Homo-oligomer: 281 residues x 4
C-alpha cells in the first residue's frame, strides 16, 4: 500500500493506493492506519474514483485538493555517516564515528518544520552553502518496528557545520529544514531495503545544476542498529521518522539558491520535488 | 507571580503564588496565563486557602495533590559555553565557540522527556559519567519575549560527548534527561538576571558528595543573543524553554548513580530537588 | 441529492446519492452538508464505488457497514390534525383544532429516542393500542427553512391518549417512539410536496395485517404555517425535524405487537422498514 | 451542599457552599459532582475566599462574575395537578387526572430554553395571560435517583392552554419558558421534602401585584410516583430536572407583563428572582 495525504479547504484527507492502481479513502488517522497494516494488512476505507494520484504527483494541486506531507510525524530523527575539520588525535570526528560501535543519531525536526511534495524547502538566511541530503527514511512505531518507507530530504547548512560541529543543531533544525514524501510505502512494498536507487537532481532555471546517484547496497551501518540506538532509553511516539543518512554530496560550489528545484527519486517510492526558498534578514 | 502545577487524580491544576503568600488557582492554561501577565500583569482566578505551597516544596505530595512540572513546554532548547577532545587547528571546539560570533544552540527535550520537582531524573543505561548541569532557564513566547524564569537541570551524559561531539544529541536527549521547576517566576520577580546565585549539591546516602556555586554575573554570552540565534529562521511555539548553559562542572569521579539526590538552588526561584534513577539493559 | 448514513465499527459515515446512481462520501457533517446544498447545491466529497445503496435498503447491513438514521436531529417536533373523547362545549378537542387559526404542535423526540431503517420501534410496556403514524417530515434550519424531506413514523400510544389528552406526552415520547429515513432528500428532489403518496403496511408473521394509503393533496394545514407556529418565540437548532401529521389511522383492533414489521412508503423518498418490539415490566 | 454556577468572560465556574458558609470551587463538572455526592458525600475542589455568594444572590453580577443556571440540564420535564374547559363525560380533564392511577407528565424544556437567577423569563408574543408556576424541582440521574432539589418556575401561557389542551406544548415550551436556581441543594440538605414553604410574589413597578404561599404537605401525588412514570420505557440522561407541579395560581387578571419581577422562595433552597420580558411580532 502507498499512503498519501491532501489538504482541501483547511482539512486533511488521507488516501492509499494499492498496487493495482485502486485508491482507497482512509477511515482512520494515517499513523493509526499504518499500524493496523503492519499487524494484518487490513485497511479501513472506501474505494474512490476521480482522485488523480498521477496528476497530483506532477501538478501538486487539482481543483480544491493539494498534496502535502503524507503524515504529521511527531518527531523526526537523523542518522549520520552510514556509508580542515574537527579531529580527535589526528583522526577526523566523522571517520571516528564511521569505525565506532556507536552510530551518530541526531534530532532532525518537529512536524511543523517539515514540508511535503511541491512545497518549498528553505535555506537559512545566514547559510552560505546549504545542501540537500537525499535519504531513505523509515516510519516507526514506539517499539521501533518499521511501519514503512519514504524519501526524505535532510536539508543541511553544511557551511555552519564545517565551521564547528557544535553548530550541527542550528545547521539541521529550522523552518523548512526537512521534506518527505510524496508517499509512505508499507513494509511489504519493498522486498529488500538494501537494494534501491537514490537519485538527486538540482534544477536551476531549467538547468540540471547537479546530478548524482547511489544504491543502498553501499550502506555500512544497518537500519536495525540505527533504530536500536535511537530508541535506547529514548521513548519515541508512533509515527516517528528516522532518516538513515545520505550518500550523495555535491561540491562546495553546489550550494542551493532561491527558486532551485530539488528532485529526489527512490525505487518503488516515487519522486519528491521541492522548490527552494532563501530566507531573509 | 510564581507559577506551579499539581497532578490530582489524573488531572492538572495550576496555581500562582503572589509575593504576599496568597495563592491563586488559575482559570487559564498556565502558558496562556504567563502571556497575559507579560502584557499587563492581569491574572484570572480565585484566591485559595488550604493549598500548602511550602509543604509541597518539601514533601512533594499532600493528600491527593502532587507537585510536578509547572508547564508542559512544547520544546526545550539549550545553550552551550556561555561562561584530549575535538580540535579545529589545535584549538578546542569548545574554546572556538567561546570566541566566535555564533553561540552554541542545541535541541534539549520534548515535554514528555522532562520531569519536575520530586520526580526522578535518569542516567542512560550506557552512560558511565552523567553530570547534572544547573542552569538558569527562560520561558519564551513565539517572538522570543521572556515570559519568565526557572531552574533547569540539563542532565548530560558527559562521557558519551567527550568520546565524540557527534554524540551530543544522544548525550542530551532521552527520557528523564531534563528537570525544571519547581516554579516559573514572572519577569518582574527578577530585577537583574545577571545577579543571581546558582548552587548545585549532590547527595549520596545522606552524604554531600559534591557542592558548588556561581553567580550569573559571570555569564559571557548574554541571554538576548542566545534567544536571537535560537529563533533565527526557527519558529518556536509559545512556552518554549531556553536553558542558558551551566557554570558548575563536577570532576570525572563525580558521575551520578542510582538513588542520588540532585538539588539546585537559584535566587528568587527556589530549590529544585530530583532523585536519580539509573536505567537498565 | 439523497442523504443517508451508516455505522461502521462504532463510527458514522454519511453518503449522498445523486439521481444518476453515483454515490458521494461526505466530507462534512450531514446537517452542515444539507445547509450548504440549500444555498448553492454544492457538495463536498469523493465519488465512491462498492457502496451498495440498493442492497443496504433491502438487507440493512453488508460486511461491516449498517444503515441507520440519516442525521442525529437535535429536536423532533410533531404537527396534529392536518387532514367518547374530550370536548369543549360539545365540540371535540380535535375538531376544534381542525377549525382554529392555531394548529397543534407538540414535542416528539430527542435524537437518542429516534431510530432508523431496519432498527426496532417500540410499544410501551403499558400501552394496549399503539399505532404507527406514517407522515411526511421536513428537515429545518434555525430560520425554519426547508433543507429537505423524509419519511417519519410518529409511533403513538393511542390508547393512553384517548384515555386523557394530558397523557399525550407520555403517549408520544419514549425510547423508540420515533423512526425516520431511510434517506433525507433535498428540497429540489420534490417538485410538489402536496402531491405524494404515503402508504402504510403492517406485517404480522408474513401476513399483511393492515394496508392503507393517501395523497398529500388532502392535507388541509399547509407546511409553512406549521413551521411558522413551531418557530414562533421558539428557537430551533439546525437539523430539527418537523413531522407534518398523519392521514392513515388503523382501527382499534390493529394495535401493534412484538415482532410486527412496519413499512412506510413515500414517493421519491423510499420505503422505511422497522421491526416492532414490545417492552416489558 | 448547595451548588451554584457563574459565567466569567465566556466560561463557567461551579461552586458549592457548605452549611458552614465555606465555598468550594469545583474540580468536576457539576452534574458529575452531584452524582459523586449522592454516592459518598465526597467533593473534589479547593476552598475559595473572595467569592461573595450573598452578594451574588442580591446583585447578580460582581466584577467579572455573574450567577446563572446552576447546571445545564439535558432535559426538563414537568408534572401536572399534584395538589368552560375540556371534559370527558361531564368530568373535567384536570379532575380526571387528579383521580386516575396515571399522573400527568409533560416535556418542559431543553437547556437553552432555560434561564437562571437574575436573567429574564419570557411571555409569548401571542399570549394574553401567562402565569409563573412556582414549583419544587428535583435533579435526577438516569435511574431516577434524586441527586438534589431546586426552585423552578414553570412559566405557562395559561390562556393558550385553556383555549385547547392540544396547545399545552406551545403553552409550555419556548425561549425563556423556564427558570431555576439559584442553587441545587443536595438530598441531605432537605430532611423532609413534603414539609417546605413555597411563596410566589409578583412585583410591578415596586408594587406587590400578587402574593401567595403553600406548603408541600399539601401535595397529593408523591414524587417517587412522578419519577416512576417519567422514566417508564423512557430513558433520561443524568442531570434531568423534574418539576413536581404548582399549587399557587393567580387569577385571570394577574397575567404577566413586560418588566415585572417574579420572585419565588422555597425553604432551605433560597429565593429565585427573574425579570419578565414580553416578546414581539
Ligand atoms: O554531520 C553529520 C550529519 C551526517 C548526515 O546527516 C548524513 O550522513 O546524512
Ligand atoms: O557540550 C555542549 C553543551 C554545553 C552545555 O550544555 C552548557 O555549557 O551548559
Ligand atoms: O393527538 C394528537 C396528535 C395528532 C397527530 O399526531 C397526527 O395527526 O399525526
Ligand atoms: O396543564 C397542565 C400542567 C399542570 C401544571 O403544570 C402544574 O400543575 O404545575
Ligand atoms: Mg543526513
Ligand atoms: Mg547545558
Ligand atoms: Mg402524528
Ligand atoms: Mg407546572
Amino acid at each position: 500500500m502507498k499512503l498519501f495525504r491532501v489538504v482541501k479547504r483547511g482539512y486533511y484527507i488521507s488516501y492509499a493506493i494499492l498496487d493495482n492502481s485502486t485508491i482507497i479513502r482512509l477511515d482512520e488517522d494515517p499513523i493509526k492506519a499504518l499500524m493496523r497494516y503492519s499487524e494484518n494488512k487490513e485497511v479501513l476505507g472506501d474505494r474512490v474514483t476521480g482522485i488523480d494520484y498521477q496528476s497530483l504527483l506532477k501538478s501538486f494541486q487539482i481543483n480544491d485538493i493539494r498534496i502535502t506531507k503524507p503524515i504529521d510525524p511527531p518527531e523526526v530523527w537523523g542518522s549520520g555517516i552510514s556509508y580542515n575539520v574537527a579531529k580527535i588525535l589526528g583522526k577526523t570526528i566523522y571517520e571516528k564515528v564511521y569505525d565506532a560501535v556507536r552510530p551518530e543519531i541526531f534530532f532532525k525536526a518537529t512536524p511543523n518544520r517539515c514540508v511535503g511534495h511541491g512545497e518549498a524547502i528553505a535555506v537559512r538566511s545566514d547559510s552560505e552553502w546549504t545542501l540537500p541530503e537525499p535519504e531513505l527514511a523509515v516510519v516507526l512505531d514506539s517499539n521501533g518496528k518499521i511501519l514503512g518507507y519514504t524519501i526524505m530530504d535532510d536539508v543541511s547548512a553544511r557551511d555552519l557545520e564545517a565551521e564547528n560541529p557544535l553548530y550541527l543543531p542550528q545547521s539541521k533544525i529550522y523552518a523548512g529544514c526537512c521534506a518527505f514524501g510524496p508517499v509512505i510505502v508499507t513494509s511489504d512494498e519493498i522486498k529488500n531495503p538494501y537494494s534501491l536507487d537514490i537519485t538527486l537532481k538540482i534544477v536551476r532555471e531549467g538547468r540540471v545544476f547537479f546530478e548524482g546517484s547511489v544504491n543502498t547496497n553501499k550502506m555500512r551501518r544497518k537500519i536495525e542498529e540505527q533504530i536500536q540506538y535511537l530508541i535506547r532509553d529514548n521513548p519515541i511516539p508512533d509515527g516517528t521518522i528516522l532518516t538513515t543518512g545520505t550518500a550523495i554530496v555535491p561540491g562546495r560550489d553546489k550550494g542551493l539558491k532561491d527558486e532551485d528545484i530539488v528532485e529526489i527519486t527512490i525505487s518503488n517510492i516515487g519522486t519528491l520535488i521541492t522548490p527552494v526558498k532563501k530566507r531573509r534578514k
